[PDB]
Write a protein that binds this ligand. Structure first.
Ligand code: BCL
Ligand code: BCL
Ligand code: BCL
Ligand code: BCL
Ligand code: BCL
Ligand code: BCL
Ligand code: BCL
Ligand code: BCL
Ligand SMILES: CCCCCC/C=C\CCCCCCCCCC(=O)O[C@H](COC(=O)CCCCCCCCCCCCCCC)COP(=O)(O)OC[C@@H](O)CO
Ligand SMILES: CCCCCC/C=C\CCCCCCCCCC(=O)O[C@H](COC(=O)CCCCCCCCCCCCCCC)COP(=O)(O)OC[C@@H](O)CO
Ligand SMILES: [Fe+3]
Lengths: 47, 306, 294, 49, 38, 32, 38, 38, 38, 38, 38, 31, 38, 38, 38, 49, 38, 49, 49, 49, 49
């Protein structure tokens, strides 16, 4: 009675947990590889 | 290794039909490049064309029968004409009178064939030029929802009448009728995920386009050249977003984000539509069992009545 | 040895060289070009706390953010007591109260939340203008964000003020603004038939399509040795037109910006001038060309 | 390159020939089974009537 | 050799197949032959 | 009353429309 | 090579499969055979 | 030089045709002439 | 060179096929011939 | 050290103006003073 | 070196002002003090 | 350095902001 | 190494935690155990 | 250093403030203490 | 270093905090303990 | 590349042959089990009737 | 080289799995076998 | 790359062999447990009936 | 990488071994506790019935 | 630098030490006040009951 | 980077060790307090019943 039925969890908290976790992991990995060290053109010349 | 010239001009079946290229002019001044150029026709190309022309012909002739072959009336009521699938009686039976629901079946069959052959064309032309085949798989992701709407959902319900009806206003009516039938379609959770992904997709598109146009001055538009060596433009674009929202991505990741958002939209949509008729008959009655409906014991209805 | 590349690939051995990220931040700082400092002669803060740039517009924004979150939590947790975000509803003052607002009457905290949120959004927009002004890029992102801000302004300020009730603003709260949307959509029959509405959803679907196509196009040519004209040839083989590199980004920006504008127009119009949308199309049947041929 | 007979030499490679043989054999078997299955569904209930 | 032979056979076998299918559908749906419970 | 304020708010909606047009015309001019 | 053999076998096996599936569906949905509770 | 002649003839023959068609439609649908069973 | 012959035959056979199909549809749907249970 | 004089006067006159404005609108909207028809 | 002093005073003034404002709003809206016609 | 042009211009801008504000707030009243 | 070991342990811990949580929530909501006033 | 000290103090003072605020809200809204007219 | 120690402590303290909060919420909302007027 | 017989030499590599053997064996076993299972659901309740 | 073997086995195992699944679900949903409370 | 027997040498690397062994052992254990469970659920209440 | 035995030398580094040991010990302890907890909830009220 | 004791030398800089001192003192004072406030809002009305 | 024992030398740096000590001590204290609090809420009102 006080609790949400089964399939409330499966249908609504797979999205609400999985999407937030996915965003917070994917952002970490994209920002890591972006702010990493690799080939660039010099600021003092190209610009 | 790969000759582009022999892939731009090569007779027929293995070549392009419109050999002379043309210029649009006004497109050149506002859209960048503005040449129309040749279009390649292969084996898979001719099939989709003829099947689509067959389905469209079937549908267009059946419009005329409804108006009595009157071109004045035909032009007046063109936007609300439609052809509808069979009624609930003889739900899945394929033997129905032509005017009642028989014309719909042939048209939808030829449409299916055309769609699949166009997919094959995409895949083959992608392999021929030496580029990857990601576009074909994305088109397959969208075809998933397309096939759930027209084939998989009417099947497993017993009625061909669940599918839409090949009309300009018929598709809006289909959307409305399905949402009303299940009841409070807003509460479907996979519908919520699909809306999340769709609005995220539009967000990403607007942002990527806007920032790239803003930093165009330093030749940041050529995303292929920048992937090998990041110039000043890409360096500025990273710094702008790093200070605003605290993190950023280079030119290679942002396109992964784009692809995956666009595809998750359609996949979650298909999964969510399929479940409405079979597992969960009433969506709002399900939401109140999941404890996510606002109590609203006494609303103020003075706003809604005029 | 091996050359790390932006796409993650490491090459088997150009003015390009491996430069660590920090170098490129120190060179592009240039403090003092803030849009605000132009007007006052100086900017109060401009000190880049952490990774975040701070300005006069950033401070008023953060004020709005903190106050709005606090008022949102005060509503629905206190005076409702539901303790469930999905169940709580934050409701505007009733239509009988009119345009005037009173602390004793209910809805006073909804109004505070709305005003704080508006302040925060506008401050954010000005901060974006500012940070772009320092880098000397251009003003496209402020415009694209201003479109959606104007949509928010239409929904919560212009349309309620024109009708005057203040009850017309959509109630905050997860899974209850949907009830407002559903009761407003059916109040005027056939919202689908609305022309300005149908252009918005057309542009939304077209935008998702463009995004998928551009993403797949760039991902396909990512890691391979090709002339860079291969993608253009592929695009000419399929549908016989290649937009170009500079063309697709303009189109993305424009479609994205246009969708929300048509949408806010449609809603503001529905509230004020049109009672139902089926009666709007009553004129089409009687067009002289075909009024008597039936 | 030379296992195919002369009449069909311009068309078929060597490897393409054995596969063509497999295809013909499979098609013949399938046709026999199809004919049998058809005779059986009339001995059950005729469709034309 | 302006007219490629294979284009002719491709368009021929597509048109023939579509035409057979369309006629078969129309005749079945007309309901005038007592074929498959009619 | 109602209609004066309504017209004045419609003005603001069209003003929101305005900036996108300036973007388009700037691109047309500065790209001969 | 004017005609690639593999294109022929691909289109053949696709057309045959689609045709078998369509005929099976039509016969099942006609309801004239007393097959699977009919 | 200020105007291409062919643009003029194209727009002229389009406008004239559309105008003839529109007038013909309006006159027919007015039902005031007893033409084709009226 | 001024007029490719194959364009002529392509457009000819397309127009002829479409026209035959349209006339047969119209005649069938008019219901004035007692053809296929009419 | 990083305290300039004009920044102080700018922030002071902005905060003071905002605060005066907020207090008047709260007092006006409270409706407890009989000021401008109340 | 570790902490800039001005960041501390900025965050301090902001937090204090927000907190005073929030408490003043909550106490006014509680309606338990008979202040400004209550 | 105070240029004294900034002070007068910001004074006038504040003046006009208060202008439209006070004027509309007074006009849109009961009495 | 066909696999990175740490990917295995990450996915293992995540799957195990999610599975324990889901089973604990299903058993609690079934209401068949008289646990926490049931 | 393996951890920046200032990150620790920032996250500590944010978490503590949020937690105090949340507990103060919950206790006030529970209505079990007779505090501010209850 | 195959595994960074600080990643472990970060994920550990996040998971522990979330888990304590979730259990506290569930126990409070179950209404089976007579805690804060229940 | 010389373990496969001569007739199938142009088609199959050396490694591709052993896989093919596994596939054929699995298919035969699956067909036997499928036939047994269909005889059983038949004996249970026929479906053509 | 004319046909890749692995493409054949991939498409074979996908088609077989899909076909088994579809038949299993049609037979279950037909309700003609008294299997799992029917 | 020489721990695998000759018959499977062109397919399996050295490292890929031990992982295979683990997979086969796990699959056998899982099948035994699956058979036991199934016998148990049948003894409880049969599902074909 | 030498601390690991020869059989598993191509797979495991030297540091990856000790963490594997910790994982195995934790898994064994968890399984023992899980078995005890299931015996207890059964004795309380059986679920299959 | 060199004002921090040797045990904590690798971790703390010189400036980071004094701030740590301030933090510890503030935390102790806050805990004392929190304990007093809890004793008071208990003597008033208990919450466990 | 030599204060950690030899068995755990490849894993832990020198600075990472003292933190690990703090973490272990805190975890032990927290577990003791958790056990005490659970005994107290079992004496108050049991939850399994
Ligand atoms: C029965 C109900 C009617 C209906 C009634 C309405 C109504 C009513 C409306 C729409 C509107 C919209 N509908 Mg409709 N709609 C229906 C059916 C559809 C269908 C469909 C397939 O059937 C579609 C695709 C749409 C699509 C849309 C677009 C036309 C439009 C989207 C809103 C938007 O862009 O601006 C929304 C923009 C904003 C409000 C966003 C503002 C965001 C701010 C700037 C960000 C705040 C920051 C926030 C706190 C996050 C902080 C970040 C931190 C991480 C926390 N409708 C049905 C038929 N539709 C809406 C519209 O017109 O837009 C004005 C609206 O008014
Ligand atoms: C019972 C009478 C029904 C009717 C039902 C049908 C149906 C049904 C069909 C036709 C078809 C045709 N009808 Mg009729 N038709 C009727 C009245 C008419 C009238 C009329 C009185 O005016 C006319 C002029 C026609 C005329 C025609 C032709 C247009 C057409 C076939 C001609 C030809 O030989 O095929 C041209 C040549 C061939 C088709 C070559 C065949 C190629 C090979 C032999 C195909 C083998 C397929 C094989 C099974 C695939 C597997 C082989 C692998 C090797 C294993 N019908 C009445 C209404 N009619 C047929 C159609 O066109 O479909 C093609 C069609 O199916
Ligand atoms: C009971 C009678 C029903 C009916 C029900 C069906 C059904 C159902 C089917 C047909 C099919 C066919 N019918 Mg019939 N059919 C009827 C009346 C007719 C009439 C008519 C009186 O005019 C005609 C002309 C036909 C004619 C035909 C052919 C067009 C077609 C198969 C021909 C052929 O041998 O296959 C061409 C050759 C082959 C199919 C090669 C087969 C290839 C190999 C053997 C396939 C093996 C598949 C295997 C299981 C996959 C696993 C193998 C792995 C190695 C393990 N039917 C009546 C209405 N008919 C069949 C169809 O076309 O689908 C193929 C179909 O399924
Ligand atoms: C019964 C009388 C019905 C009617 C029913 C039809 C129908 C039905 C048709 C026509 C068609 C035509 N009718 Mg009539 N028609 C009527 C009254 C009229 C009147 C009138 C009184 O004013 C006129 C002027 C016409 C005039 C015409 C022509 C416009 C047209 C065919 C002319 C020609 O020879 O074909 C031009 C030349 C040819 C068509 C070349 C043919 C090419 C080859 C021989 C096609 C072979 C196809 C073959 C089967 C494919 C397989 C071959 C492979 C090698 C195996 N009809 C009345 C209402 N009429 C026919 C039409 O145009 O379709 C084309 C059509 O089908
Ligand atoms: C009362 C009986 C209920 C039921 C309620 C539950 C509940 C509730 C749970 C299970 C769980 C499990 N059940 Mg049971 N289960 C039932 C009937 C069954 C049946 C059946 C009859 O067919 C089966 C086969 C199972 C089988 C299982 C396993 C799948 C699973 C745990 C196995 C294992 O040891 O964990 C695998 C190994 C471990 C979990 C390693 C543990 C790791 C360490 C020890 C975790 C420590 C966490 C610690 C607190 C964190 C802080 C530590 C810091 C150092 C301080 N249950 C009936 C319906 N079952 C448990 C689950 O899987 O969750 C994971 C679960 O929580
Ligand atoms: C009346 C009893 C109510 C209740 C109401 C509250 C309220 C209300 C609060 C707590 C808070 C706390 N409660 Mg209690 N609490 C209750 C029952 C419990 C129970 C239980 C029986 O199980 C427990 C375990 C706790 C435990 C706790 C701790 C988690 C927490 C504070 C601990 C600490 O000292 O602060 C940790 C250390 C400090 C907070 C450092 C303080 C830092 C400095 C001193 C802050 C100065 C602020 C200053 C004013 C700003 C201006 C200074 C400028 C220099 C001028 N409460 C019952 C329900 N409890 C407090 C909370 O956590 O907020 C943080 C909170 O406000
Ligand atoms: C309905 C009557 C019985 C019932 C009848 C049966 C029967 C009969 C069976 C089961 C089976 C099982 N049941 Mg049961 N079961 C019941 C109720 C329960 C309950 C509970 C809530 O009550 C639980 C928890 C379970 C749980 C289980 C598991 C013990 C087991 C399924 C194994 C499997 O699927 O995983 C397999 C998972 C995978 C294939 C992958 C495993 C992942 C690996 C181990 C993780 C390492 C991955 C590695 C790192 C590589 C990473 C790769 C990436 C993932 C790609 N059952 C009811 C009471 N149950 C089946 C079983 O025991 O057979 C073993 C069995 O046959
Ligand atoms: C329902 C019956 C009892 C109840 C039963 C229990 C029981 C039983 C227990 C608790 C426990 C606790 N309860 Mg209780 N509890 C009750 C009511 C309350 C009330 C109140 C409002 O009345 C309060 C304030 C609390 C509060 C608490 C805490 C004292 C404690 C939980 C510790 C934990 O989760 O944090 C852990 C947080 C984390 C894991 C991270 C901690 C963060 C560190 C310390 C901050 C430094 C971080 C560092 C800088 C590194 C930064 C990294 C970042 C974090 C990423 N309870 C009711 C009265 N409560 C549990 C406890 O005491 O065990 C210790 C316990 O077992
Ligand atoms: C209203 C009419 C209800 C008819 C239901 C129906 O006819 O259900 C269909 C089956 O028809 C069948 O066997 C025939 C079903 C006969 C009716 C059985 C009772 C259906 C209950 C409806 C609720 C559904 O297609 P499925 O076979 O599920 O597979 C399709 C999916 O896998 C696609 O991905
Ligand atoms: C308190 C505020 C409340 C009101 C909130 C309003 C919110 C939304 C409605 C209006 C939208 C606001 C967005 C304004 C963004 C201004 C952007 C701007 O000011 O853009 C400039 C002018 O645009 C223009 O017409 C700008 C025209 C603006 C019209 C007035 C608005 C043009 O910059 P560009 O020349 O394109 O740079 C091109 C680069 O390539 C240069 O290299
Ligand atoms: Fe891009």
């Amino acid at each position: 009675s006080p609790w949400p039925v089964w399939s409330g969890y499966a249908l609504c908290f797979v999205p609400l947990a999985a999407v937030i976790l996915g965003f917070i992991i994917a952002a970490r990995f994209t920002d890591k590889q972006a702010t990493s060290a690799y080939l660039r053109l010099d600021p003092a010349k190209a610009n | 290794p790969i000759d582009l010239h022999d892939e731009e001009y090569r007779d027929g079946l293995e070549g392009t039909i419109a050999k002379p290229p043309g210029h649009v002019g006004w497109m050149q001044r506002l859209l960048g490049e503005g040449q129309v150029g040749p279009i390649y026709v292969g084996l898979w190309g001719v099939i989709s064309f003829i099947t689509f022309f067959a389905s469209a012909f079937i549908i267009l002739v059946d419009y005329g029968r409804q108006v009595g072959w009157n071109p004045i009336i035909y032009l007046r009521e063109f936007w609300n004409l439609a052809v509808y699938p069979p009624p609930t009686e003889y739900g899945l039976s394929w033997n129905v009178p032509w005017d009642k629901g028989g014309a719909w079946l042939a048209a939808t069959f030829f449409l299916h064939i055309s769609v699949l052959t166009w997919w094959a064309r995409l895949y083959t032309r992608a392999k021929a030029t030496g580029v990857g085949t990601q576009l074909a798989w994305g088109f397959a992701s969208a075809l998933s929802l397309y096939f759930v709407i027209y084939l998989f959902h009417p099947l497993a319900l017993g009625n061909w009448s669940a599918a839409p009806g090949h009309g300009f206003r018929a598709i809006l009516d289909w959307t409305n009728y399905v949402s009303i039938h299940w009841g409070n379609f807003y509460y479907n959770p996979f519908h919520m995920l699909s809306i999340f992904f769709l609005l995220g997709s539009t967000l990403l598109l607007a942002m990527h386009g806007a920032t790239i146009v803003a930093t165009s001055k330093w030749k940041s538009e050529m995303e292929f050249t920048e992937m090998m060596a990041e110039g000043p433009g890409t360096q500025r674009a990273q710094l702008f977003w790093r200070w605003v929202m605290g993190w950023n991505a280079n030119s290679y990741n942002i396109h992964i984000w784009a692809w995956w958002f666009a595809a998750f939209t359609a996949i979650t949509g298909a999964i969510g539509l399929f479940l409405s008729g079979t597992l969960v008959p009433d969506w709002y009655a399900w939401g109140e069992t999941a404890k996510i409906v606002a109590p609203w014991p006494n609303p103020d209805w003075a706003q809604y009545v005029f | 040895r091996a050359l790390p590349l932006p796409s993650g690939e490491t090459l088997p051995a150009a003015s390009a060289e491996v430069i660590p990220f920090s170098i490129i931040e120190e060179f592009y700082k240039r403090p003092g070009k803030t849009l605000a400092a132009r007007f006052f002669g100086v900017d109060p803060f401009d000190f880049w706390i952490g990774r975040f740039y701070v300005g006069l517009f950033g401070a008023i924004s953060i004020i709005g953010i903190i106050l709005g979150v606090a008022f949102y939590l005060y509503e629905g947790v206190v005076n409702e007591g539901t303790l469930n975000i999905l169940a709580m509803r934050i409701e505007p003052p009733p239509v009988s109260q009119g345009l005037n607002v009173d602390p004793a009457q209910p809805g006073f905290f909804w109004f505070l939340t709305m005003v704080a949120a508006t302040i925060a959004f506008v401050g954010w927009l000005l901060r974006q203008i500012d940070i772009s002004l320092k880098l000397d890029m251009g003003m496209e992102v402020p415009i694209a964000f201003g479109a959606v801000v104007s949509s928010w302004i239409t929904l919560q300020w212009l349309r309620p003020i024109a009708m005057g009730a203040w009850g017309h603003g959509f109630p905050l709260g997860i899974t209850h603004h949907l009830d407002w949307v559903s009761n407003i959509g059916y109040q005027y029959y056939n919202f689908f038939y609305n022309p300005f509405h149908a252009i918005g959803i057309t542009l939304l679907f077209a935008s998702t399509l463009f995004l998928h196509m551009h993403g797949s196009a760039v991902l396909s040519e990512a890691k391979r040795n090709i002339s860079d004209q291969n993608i253009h040839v592929f695009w000419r083989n399929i549908l016989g037109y290649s937009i170009g590199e500079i063309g697709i980004h303009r189109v993305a920006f424009w479609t994205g910006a246009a969708s929300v504008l048509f949408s806010n127009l449609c809603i503001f119009l529905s509230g004020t001038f049109v009672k139902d949308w089926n009666a709007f199309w009553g004129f089409w049947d009687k067009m002289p060309i075909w009024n008597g041929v039936g | 390159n030379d296992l195919v007979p002369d009449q069909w030499k311009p068309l078929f490679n060597n490897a393409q020939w054995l596969v063509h043989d497999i295809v013909v054999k499979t098609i013949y078997g399938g046709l026999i089974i199809a004919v049998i299955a058809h005779v059986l569904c009339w001995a059950w209930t005729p469709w034309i009537r | 050799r302006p007219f490629e032979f294979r284009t002719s056979v491709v368009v021929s076998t597509l048109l023939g197949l579509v035409m057979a299918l369309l006629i078969h559908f129309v005749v079945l749906s007309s309901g005038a032959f007592n074929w498959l419970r009619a | 009353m109602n209609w004066i304020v309504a017209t004045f708010m419609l003005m603001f909606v069209l003003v929101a429309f305005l900036p996108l047009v300036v973007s388009l015309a700037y691109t047309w001019v500065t790209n001969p």
